[PDB]
RNA sequence: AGGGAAAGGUGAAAAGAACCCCGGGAGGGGAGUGAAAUAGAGCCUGAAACCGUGGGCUUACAAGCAGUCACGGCCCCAAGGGGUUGUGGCGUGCCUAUUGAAGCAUGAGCCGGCGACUCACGGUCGUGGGCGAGCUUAAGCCGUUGAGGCGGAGGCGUA
RNA sequence: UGGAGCCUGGGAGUGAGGGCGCGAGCGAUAACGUCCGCGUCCGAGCGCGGGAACAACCGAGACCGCCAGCUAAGGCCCCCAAGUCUGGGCUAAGUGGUAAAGGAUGUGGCGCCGCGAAGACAGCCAGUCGAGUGGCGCCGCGCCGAAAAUGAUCGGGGCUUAAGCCCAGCGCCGAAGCUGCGGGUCUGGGGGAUGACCCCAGGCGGUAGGGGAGCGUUCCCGAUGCCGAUGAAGGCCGACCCGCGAGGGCGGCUGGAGGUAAGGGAAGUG
RNA sequence: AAGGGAUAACCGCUGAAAGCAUCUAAGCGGGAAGCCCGCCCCAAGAUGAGGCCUCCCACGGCGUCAAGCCGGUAAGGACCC
């Protein structure tokens, strides 16, 4: 889960370390590394989550 | 539509009508639960906090059931220590009814 | 269930050449490509990395004073069968070898590890004598 | 002088396979007896090691206490199972003996069967009952023929 | 209020210890050496994470299950999960990647002393020359001193404004530890129509041993009975059902005459 | 062994840090029966299985349609002697 999340979110600018910290502050106790298969099905919606994440991050 | 509900200490991706198993609920035989525990949709909802305020997913309970048996068995050498135990985790099956967020 | 799992997609090819670059600092990323570790199909048991062609080998920068000082080694199973050959002499003849050795070491060591080392094509160049694609990365 | 084994079993009944066929014979193949002949004669049942034939999966750039977890392919009844194993993760045999053993320390080729905390009489705690300031009989005698009675010599206890 | 304590009694094993830290003796301020003393871990936690590999160094005391979440030591360039993350310095030996007396204008940072228009510190008659010159002494990092026997290597590749060393800062990865959800068993506590069923809270690594529950084998009473050729015992198969487990049912083929409940009793009992 | 290239101790050029001097700190030359290649031998299972010369080519009959198909060929190759 982690190896491919990293691959996917590294494809938008940032890295895994950063992405998870973001979500933490962003208040989305969600992804559940399991359920970041969103990266493969519906990357539309992954993209959204990355925005929220870098929202709390920069 | 989509939806990412939470039950049994774990999370899942549900849709109009299917389900698998999920852990004993204290839920009587043929009745109906709402799993207000719910994040995300198929129109890009997300969740300002953990939960999306006005949101839920309806499902109907089909019944309970014990899993396939697993043998847990321990051994330590040069010591005559061996142990055999038989294990079966219980579950419940749902039927997803609709996603009203 | 959640087996995210791939289905076989068409393998991509790539051309690259940091002819002006520090090897190791090059070879690292090459390998990360030879495994599908950049793409979120990643599946550890299968081989869906990129095919990789590297033009213009030799030319590579090597830090510090690593000529005569970096020594390469081969032992035949015989008495006194040790060979010690320094970096200078490897570029001098068989420089395609240098970047090859360096990537080998960064690849896993199973059968699948040898399969990926075959996906890596190295030419002291330029001119990579096979044309049928190559989305060059810089 | 002395030591000293192994080895039991067709079927209710021999009705124990005339006759034909291949073979020197031994064996078989038809036929026939029988409820049954993988009950056909060191013949009831016929387990395991061990040796064959046929079929599915699988292997000639690999590397191992031989398995396990995960994907993936093929093969057989169906949204689930069973068989097999390509790749990937993880993994120092059992027993004994020892401060310490995968150990290059002991034992064991493999399978089956035999194989080691008992009984008597005292003793001492515990415990389920009987009767209690008392409780209890031994040898024997009378009955039963898988019936129980009687018998206070004695013994423990009451300083 | 603790798997604390004290009193009386039944059952033991042990009486060969080992490493580490600290305090002494012996030894040579030698030994995986040896003697005692205080503590720990292995023993019995060769179960799990870190340490390349490795009983006792660091992290941590493993009832079971989950394709959930947070951490610990140690880690985040690839092999290998996570920063080629940010800001300031040092080092050019691959030091790092394991050695001393003693040597050296290696470097970088501090010194406080000579004496410089009685303008020689370095150079050719002292005039020109027109300025920085020497002197020990501290601190950081490195250099020589450095020769052993099968093929080499910091675990490997490979690293030089670092992937080394020093000092800050934020973030992630990471165990069988801690949370989340479900289940078991044992205690304690609640109900108290004691229901042996519902609710709550703790405990459950384990060698020598102590204690508690069960399962199965042979035989006896139950028996002048009950099952049995419409198939006993035994044998061969199963992905099914019930038990935590030893086990017990169910079904199909084989076998051809024996088998024996509920509840109890003996022992040539695994 | 000739021979060609790179080196060890060691011998030099040019040259500052440090107006002098210094083989060195940027550079450049000499220099061993030793190192590399050269001589002789093995070698494409070098699963990274190489290259050059010459030859032989037809579907003839059937499945999840190029053998995973059986039976005759071709250039060739075995068997027996």
UniProtKB/Swiss-Prot annotation, chain A:
This is Large ribosomal subunit protein bL20. It comes from Thermus thermophilus (strain ATCC 27634 / DSM 579 / HB8). Binds directly to 23S ribosomal RNA and is necessary for the in vitro assembly process of the 50S ribosomal subunit. It is not involved in the protein synthesizing functions of that subunit. The chain holds residues 61 to 118 of 118 of the full protein. Belongs to the bacterial ribosomal protein bL20 family. It comes from the Bacteria. Disulfide bonds: none annotated. Transmembrane segments: none annotated. The gene is rplT. The lineage of its organism: Bacteria, Thermotogati, Deinococcota, Deinococci, Thermales.
From Swiss-Prot, chain B:
Coiled coil: none annotated. It holds the Pfam family Ribosomal_L21p. SUPFAM superfamilies: L21p-like. GO terms for molecular function: rRNA binding; structural constituent of ribosome. GO terms for cellular component: cytoplasm; ribonucleoprotein complex; ribosome. This protein binds to 23S rRNA in the presence of protein L20. Found on the solvent side of the large subunit. This is Large ribosomal subunit protein bL21. The gene is rplU.
Swiss-Prot record, chain C:
It comes from the Bacteria. This is Large ribosomal subunit protein uL13. The gene is rplM. PROSITE patterns: RIBOSOMAL_L13. One of its GO terms (cellular component) is cytosolic large ribosomal subunit. Keywords: Ribonucleoprotein, Ribosomal protein. Pfam families: Ribosomal_L13. NCBIfam families: rplM_bact. Part of the 50S ribosomal subunit. Belongs to the universal ribosomal protein uL13 family. One of its GO terms (biological process) is negative regulation of translation. This protein is one of the early assembly proteins of the 50S ribosomal subunit, although it is not seen to bind rRNA by itself. It is important during the early stages of 50S assembly. It comes from Thermus thermophilus (strain ATCC 27634 / DSM 579 / HB8). InterPro entries: Ribosomal_uL13, Ribosomal_uL13_bac-type, Ribosomal_uL13_CS, Ribosomal_uL13_sf.
